[PDB]
Design an enzyme around this catalytic site. Structure first.
Site, PDB file in Angstrom:
ATOM      1  N   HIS D  41      63.220  31.932  50.736  1.00 20.09           N
ATOM      2  CA  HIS D  41      64.670  31.766  50.759  1.00 20.09           C
ATOM      3  C   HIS D  41      65.174  30.518  50.034  1.00 20.09           C
ATOM      4  O   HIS D  41      66.362  30.405  49.720  1.00 20.09           O
ATOM      5  CB  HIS D  41      65.189  31.785  52.202  1.00 20.09           C
ATOM      6  CG  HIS D  41      65.092  30.466  52.904  1.00 20.09           C
ATOM      7  ND1 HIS D  41      64.248  30.253  53.972  1.00 20.09           N
ATOM      8  CD2 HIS D  41      65.780  29.310  52.731  1.00 20.09           C
ATOM      9  CE1 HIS D  41      64.423  29.026  54.431  1.00 20.09           C
ATOM     10  NE2 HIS D  41      65.349  28.433  53.697  1.00 20.09           N
ATOM     11  N   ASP D  90      59.389  35.211  54.547  1.00 19.63           N
ATOM     12  CA  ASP D  90      59.928  33.981  53.993  1.00 19.63           C
ATOM     13  C   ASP D  90      58.821  33.025  53.545  1.00 19.63           C
ATOM     14  O   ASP D  90      58.567  31.990  54.166  1.00 19.63           O
ATOM     15  CB  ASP D  90      60.834  33.327  55.033  1.00 19.63           C
ATOM     16  CG  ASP D  90      61.711  32.253  54.443  1.00 19.63           C
ATOM     17  OD1 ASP D  90      61.818  32.185  53.207  1.00 19.63           O
ATOM     18  OD2 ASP D  90      62.309  31.486  55.216  1.00 19.63           O
ATOM     19  N   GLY D 190      67.224  22.102  55.366  1.00 19.89           N
ATOM     20  CA  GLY D 190      66.714  21.080  54.473  1.00 19.89           C
ATOM     21  C   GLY D 190      65.221  20.853  54.677  1.00 19.89           C
ATOM     22  O   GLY D 190      64.553  20.308  53.801  1.00 19.89           O
ATOM     23  N   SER D 192      63.358  23.451  55.471  1.00 23.73           N
ATOM     24  CA  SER D 192      62.839  24.756  55.035  1.00 23.73           C
ATOM     25  C   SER D 192      61.742  24.646  53.973  1.00 23.73           C
ATOM     26  O   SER D 192      61.839  23.849  53.050  1.00 23.73           O
ATOM     27  CB  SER D 192      63.979  25.619  54.477  1.00 23.73           C
ATOM     28  OG  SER D 192      64.925  25.962  55.481  1.00 23.73           O
ATOM     29  N   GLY D 193      60.706  25.469  54.097  1.00 16.77           N
ATOM     30  CA  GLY D 193      59.625  25.441  53.128  1.00 16.77           C
ATOM     31  C   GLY D 193      58.548  24.426  53.462  1.00 16.77           C
ATOM     32  O   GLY D 193      57.447  24.484  52.913  1.00 16.77           O
TER      33      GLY D 193
HETATM   34  C1  LIG Z   1      65.537  31.817  56.059  1.00 14.28           C
HETATM   35  C2  LIG Z   1      66.915  31.957  55.383  1.00 14.28           C
HETATM   36  C3  LIG Z   1      67.671  30.641  55.225  1.00 14.28           C
HETATM   37  C4  LIG Z   1      68.517  30.504  54.104  1.00 14.28           C
HETATM   38  C5  LIG Z   1      69.238  29.325  53.871  1.00 14.28           C
HETATM   39  C6  LIG Z   1      69.128  28.257  54.789  1.00 14.28           C
HETATM   40  C7  LIG Z   1      69.874  27.058  54.528  1.00 14.28           C
HETATM   41  C8  LIG Z   1      71.284  27.170  54.531  1.00 14.28           C
HETATM   42  C9  LIG Z   1      72.070  26.043  54.282  1.00 14.28           C
HETATM   43  C10 LIG Z   1      71.504  24.797  54.031  1.00 14.28           C
HETATM   44  C11 LIG Z   1      72.451  23.688  53.782  1.00 14.28           C
HETATM   45  O1  LIG Z   1      73.719  23.636  54.399  1.00 14.28           O
HETATM   46  N1  LIG Z   1      71.973  22.629  52.878  1.00 14.28           N
HETATM   47  C12 LIG Z   1      72.682  21.384  53.216  1.00 14.28           C
HETATM   48  C13 LIG Z   1      71.694  20.222  53.096  1.00 14.28           C
HETATM   49  C14 LIG Z   1      70.528  20.388  54.079  1.00 14.28           C
HETATM   50  C15 LIG Z   1      71.211  20.121  51.624  1.00 14.28           C
HETATM   51  C16 LIG Z   1      70.097  24.653  54.021  1.00 14.28           C
HETATM   52  C17 LIG Z   1      69.284  25.794  54.268  1.00 14.28           C
HETATM   53  C18 LIG Z   1      67.820  25.619  54.222  1.00 14.28           C
HETATM   54  O2  LIG Z   1      67.210  26.343  53.419  1.00 14.28           O
HETATM   55  O3  LIG Z   1      67.259  24.779  54.936  1.00 14.28           O
HETATM   56  C19 LIG Z   1      68.324  28.408  55.949  1.00 14.28           C
HETATM   57  C20 LIG Z   1      68.226  27.298  56.986  1.00 14.28           C
HETATM   58  N2  LIG Z   1      66.870  26.976  57.418  1.00 14.28           N
HETATM   59  C21 LIG Z   1      66.564  26.597  58.703  1.00 14.28           C
HETATM   60  C22 LIG Z   1      65.217  26.252  58.962  1.00 14.28           C
HETATM   61  C23 LIG Z   1      64.828  25.883  60.273  1.00 14.28           C
HETATM   62  C24 LIG Z   1      65.822  25.840  61.294  1.00 14.28           C
HETATM   63  C25 LIG Z   1      65.411  25.467  62.659  1.00 14.28           C
HETATM   64  N3  LIG Z   1      66.364  25.198  63.612  1.00 14.28           N
HETATM   65  N4  LIG Z   1      64.074  25.415  62.978  1.00 14.28           N
HETATM   66  C26 LIG Z   1      67.194  26.132  61.014  1.00 14.28           C
HETATM   67  N5  LIG Z   1      67.556  26.503  59.710  1.00 14.28           N
HETATM   68  C27 LIG Z   1      67.581  29.601  56.169  1.00 14.28           C
END
Ligand SMILES: C=Cc1ccc(-c2ccc(C(=O)NCC(C)C)cc2C(=O)O)c(CNc2ccc(C(=N)N)cn2)c1
Ligand SMILES: C[C@@H]1O[C@@H](O)[C@@H](O)[C@H](O)[C@@H]1O
Ligand SMILES: OC[C@H]1OC[C@@H](O)[C@@H](O)[C@H]1O
Ligand SMILES: [Ca+2]
Ligand SMILES: [Ca+2]
Ligand SMILES: [Ca+2]
Ligand SMILES: [Ca+2]
Ligand SMILES: [Ca+2]
Ligand SMILES: [Ca+2]
Ligand SMILES: [Ca+2]
Ligand SMILES: [Ca+2]
Ligand SMILES: [Ca+2]
Lengths: 75, 142, 116, 254
Positions: D41, D90, D190, D192-193
């Site tokens: 993602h 993912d 943020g 993520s990954g």
């Molecule tokens: C899996 C699909 C997916 C798509 C996009 C985002 C997404 C959407 C928006 C933003 C965002 O507003 N960026 C702002 C700043 C951080 C740069 C970041 C992400 C991301 O990929 O992390 C997420 C979110 N991922 C997670 C991972 C773990 C947890 C948890 N509680 N364990 C909660 N959210 C997930």
């Protein structure tokens, strides 16, 4: 397969035995036991019995609080 | 137990119940108190579930009410000490004592292996690094 | 992941049943009688050796004695009782393992009866 | 990361920071000198596939030291089953154009065999998750790498312990929960990954990938991670694959 039910603790002077239902029909069981923050330990591997001696695991610390789980496996 | 001419004998719990075997009336019939009688009769008539020597592999039995407890030798466990701890060397059991990878082999002893970058020691279960920076290790702490 | 079911939580020290005790012996020392409770061994091992119930509970464990027209009770912090008895009378005894602090399963079954 | 601590410099050596056109994109995990595992993602809105950079040995984003190493990302491999905008499958396998140099601050995390991971690592209670993600559900991101200890839960328990939510994604066999439901600690946007690393008898292994969750550290919810054990075979085969013309490769799965 069906999940075990009626898990009951049978313990006297710490000799502790977990018992459950039902009699296994085309399925085996494996028990896991753990403490709130510890790792899960497996016991009575693929047994067909409906009980499992967990004595050796609880006597490691009688004051700890343990949680057990009964897995059901096909075949 | 009573057989005419041992009736003349005066009451005797020893005689009586320990001795021969007695009935509830016969304990009655010695203790008087209800209470006191049951108290005695509770254990006396419960039976010795250890008579069937249920504890295996050199285990020791200890009678209880309608049950028993088996005290097993170090290498055994189970309600009746039937489980041989030595026959549990399988991968699902604490990874078979392997440090990294474990492989089950029916008919033969399970075997241990290692991730790339490591090698199995002579103890047949430990893995040691074969490169300067093996995966999964933290240098600044080693 | 396979189908499974969780068991209720279990805290050994607080839930394990107390085993049936056995009166080891009893003798008279004048006008008093001593009643000794056998050490009740458990599955807990302390380096190759089964610990007694007292080894495990220590002060958390007491033993109650029933002797005798009702009954006469006596309690001890050890495994021994020293009671007063009328000369020329034969008394009977019965002991019970107890962990006073427990609200449930606080007592074991009574030991077999023994009389002088 | 919410409720975690700063990861001491050099103590999260396999942590990777991904950048797209110089800006922070996602986290990742180094598994050998040329491959990085991240989340699929993370590349949903990528348009400039040639401006993808992986940074190893990073710690404090506000300053540069001689331990940082950057490598252009030559290939982004994701399962063809993955559907952008969703949560299943993912995962992403990244090929660095040039290998990084292993040092005291740059070390790969071990990718485990499937069985060892399913019957052994899956039952080790706590694991570490890290990243430069948000410090609070809606808050700012971290300047210094944050790490956190989280307990794993079998899916059945996760479901029974989570607060029922309208149209929440299903927790598939390719996922697993970890964390706390009391709103105190969790990975976050943020992160993520990034890695969910499990310690076992002296070695660390990759078991999860920060994937998704209801907000961050939300009462009645757990963080959700990609179940790496389900892609071991898929990852190994692809790491032995030959490079291709384009960056992105949607590879078949299984
Ligand atoms: C899996 C699909 C997916 C798509 C996009 C985002 C997404 C959407 C928006 C933003 C965002 O507003 N960026 C702002 C700043 C951080 C740069 C970041 C992400 C991301 O990929 O992390 C997420 C979110 N991922 C997670 C991972 C773990 C947890 C948890 N509680 N364990 C909660 N959210 C997930
Ligand atoms: C354990 C068991 C005591 O108990 C003995 O009766 C057995 O020989 C054995 O040690
Ligand atoms: O005496 C009671 C015991 O008898 C024999 C044992 O094998 C078991 O059946 C147990 O019930
Ligand atoms: Ca008679
Ligand atoms: Ca008669
Ligand atoms: Ca006779
Ligand atoms: Ca008579
Ligand atoms: Ca006699
Ligand atoms: Ca006789
Ligand atoms: Ca009569
Ligand atoms: Ca009995
Ligand atoms: Ca920097």
């Amino acid at each position: 397969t069906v999940a075990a039910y009626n898990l009951t603790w049978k313990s006297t002077n710490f000799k502790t035995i977990l018992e459950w239902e039902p009699k296994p029909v085309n399925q085996v069981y494996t028990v896991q036991i753990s403490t709130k923050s510890g790792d899960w330990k497996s016991k009575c591997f693929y047994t067909t019995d409906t009980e499992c001696d967990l004595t050796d695991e609880i006597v490691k610390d009688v004051k700890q609080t343990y949680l057990a789980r009964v897995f059901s496996y096909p075949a | 137990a009573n057989a005419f001419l041992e009736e003349l004998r005066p009451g005797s719990l020893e005689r009586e119940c320990k001795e021969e075997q007695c009935s509830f009336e016969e304990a009655r019939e010695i203790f008087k108190d209800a209470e006191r009688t049951k108290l005695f009769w509770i254990s006396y008539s419960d039976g010795d579930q250890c008579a069937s020597s249920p504890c295996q592999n050199g285990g020791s039995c200890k009678d209880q009410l309608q049950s028993y407890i088996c005290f097993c030798l170090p290498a055994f466990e189970g309600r009746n000490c039937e489980t041989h701890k030595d026959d549990q060397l399988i991968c699902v059991n604490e990874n078979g004592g392997c440090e990294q990878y474990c492989s089950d082999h029916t008919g033969t002893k399970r075997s241990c292996r290692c991730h790339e970058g490591y090698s199995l020691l002579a103890d047949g279960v430990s893995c040691t690094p074969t490169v300067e920076y093996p995966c999964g290790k933290i240098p600044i702490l080693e | 992941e396979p189908l499974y079911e969780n068991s209720p939580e279990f805290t050994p020290y607080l839930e394990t049943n107390l085993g049936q005790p056995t009166i080891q012996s009893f003798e008279q020392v004048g006008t008093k009688v001593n009643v000794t409770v056998e050490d009740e061994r458990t599955l807990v091992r302390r380096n190759n050796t089964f610990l007694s119930l007292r080894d495990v509970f220590g002060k958390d464990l007491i033993y109650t004695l029933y002797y005798w027209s009702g009954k006469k009770t006596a309690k001890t912090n050890t495994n021994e009782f020293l009671i007063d008895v009328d000369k020329g009378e034969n008394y009977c005894f019965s002991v019970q393992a107890v962990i006073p602090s427990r609200t449930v399963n606080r007592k074991s079954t009574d030991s077999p009866v023994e009389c002088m | 990361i919410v409720g975690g601590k700063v990861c001491p410099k050099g103590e999260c050596p396999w942590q990777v920071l991904l950048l797209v056109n110089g800006a922070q994109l996602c986290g990742g995990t180094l598994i050998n000198t040329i491959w990085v595992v991240s989340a699929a993602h993370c590349f949903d809105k990528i348009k400039n596939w040639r401006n993808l950079i992986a940074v190893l040995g990073e710690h404090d984003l506000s300053e540069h030291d001689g331990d940082e190493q950057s490598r252009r990302v030559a290939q982004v491999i994701i399962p063809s089953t993955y559907v952008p905008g969703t949560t299943n499958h993912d995962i992403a396998l990244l090929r660095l154009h040039q290998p990084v140099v292993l040092t005291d601050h740059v070390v790969p995390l071990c990718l485990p065999e499937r069985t060892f991971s399913e019957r052994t690592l899956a039952f080790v209670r706590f694991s570490l998750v890290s990243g430069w993600g948000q410090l609070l559900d809606r808050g700012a991101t971290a300047l210094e790498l944050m790490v956190l200890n989280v307990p794993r839960l079998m899916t059945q328990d996760c479901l029974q312990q989570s607060r029922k939510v309208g149209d929440s994604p299903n927790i598939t066999e390719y996922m697993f929960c970890a964390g706390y439901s009391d709103g105190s600690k969790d990975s976050c946007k943020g992160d993520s990954g990034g890695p969910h690393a499990t310690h076992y008898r002296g070695t660390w292994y990759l078991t999860g990938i920060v994937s998704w969750g209801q907000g961050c550290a939300t009462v009645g919810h757990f963080g959700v991670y990609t179940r790496v054990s389900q892609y071991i075979e898929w990852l190994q085969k692809l790491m032995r694959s030959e490079p291709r013309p384009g960056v992105l490769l949607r590879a078949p799965f299984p």
